[PDB]
Symmetry: D2
Subunit: 116 residues, 4 copies
């Protein structure tokens, strides 16, 4: 394998952040954000199967994590969502895990990049 | 009412000369330029806007983290960091930068 | 030369009235009390020490995060947060608190 | 299963933090920190097998992550180590993952607590 994975934790509960919606976009030649993939985290706070090594070509990707819907569905948080934007696969294929740690007024995000 | 502070977690210092662009979501759902600056020597950016123009609405603060790391000779992961929020308490948007990670917090007083 | 700032990531605010204890590692490898205070209304603690007494050495800053969350009616994970470092650039120790997580950064200028 | 696990990431490299030494202590009846377990992270940045459900009784535990040796063994970091101190198993047995994200002048740590 899965070349793009998202893992989300809840810093308030000390648990996986479950049922967090995630939308992925890819910059198109026109320079606009085209829908690329979407899904939601599981009970372990992970999201797999967004894409395939074949479809995940080079490009600029935006991973939007819908944190406000997450918190509301539980609390009124600060951010609308957490947006992770990066160039991918520009030195050849890699695997990416986008990790995010969520608090109502704060989040962090880290990328773990490996080369299968 | 809107302040940006950026810290470098690799050097344990303010992140200086970082470009910051603020946008407001237009009725057409597009992002209109609203304000921009470079962080100061203390990693701070002030006077982006006034209480008058900073009306309720959704805002985006884009921090050009990539140019920052490149200036320092370091290869970073993100294109930029983006903070998106509804203005509806002075807002401080703080960001802590590492090459492959960043954290952002809102201090609303 | 030593400042502590504490933020609450749940409320997006300064963490007020948080007890902070600083210790210095003695030659006997024990931790000697060195300084302590409560964060202010701005989540800040200053005047812990002077340039004179803040000599090189290893220091520990203990932040009583547990009492903080309990005062707010919230069940937290950590007993406290601990920042341990060698003083050898003004040191700002900043901490960002959540019930089950905290981050700490050093800003050395 | 393993009731106490540690996971460490490097925020500079975007990778697991490998060969990070970790020492665990438990507060004794005397109120001093007794050695409880130690180990080092693997190539995936994880450390398993510190202890067993049977030995991991209630108590106050300190997980010390030796971040300075880690960075030096690569850079001169700020902290001596990252120290995670918590009461465990006071409402019955739980499983704990202590996650830490490391930068030379900053770290974060999060607990994920589950009830098998």
């Amino acid at each position: 394998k899965c070349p793009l994975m998202v893992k989300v934790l809840d810093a308030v509960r000390g648990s996986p952040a479950i049922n967090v919606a995630v939308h992925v976009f890819r910059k198109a030649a026109d320079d606009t954000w085209e829908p690329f993939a979407s899904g939601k985290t599981s009970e372990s706070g992970e999201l797999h199967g967004l894409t395939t090594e074949e479809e995940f070509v080079e490009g600029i990707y935006k991973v939007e994590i819908d944190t406000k819907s997450y918190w509301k569905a539980l609390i009124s948080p600060f951010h609308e969502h957490a947006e992770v934007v990066f160039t991918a696969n520009d030195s050849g294929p890699r695997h990416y895990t986008i990790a995010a740690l969520l608090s109502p007024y704060s989040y962090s995000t880290t990328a773990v990049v490996t080369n299968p």
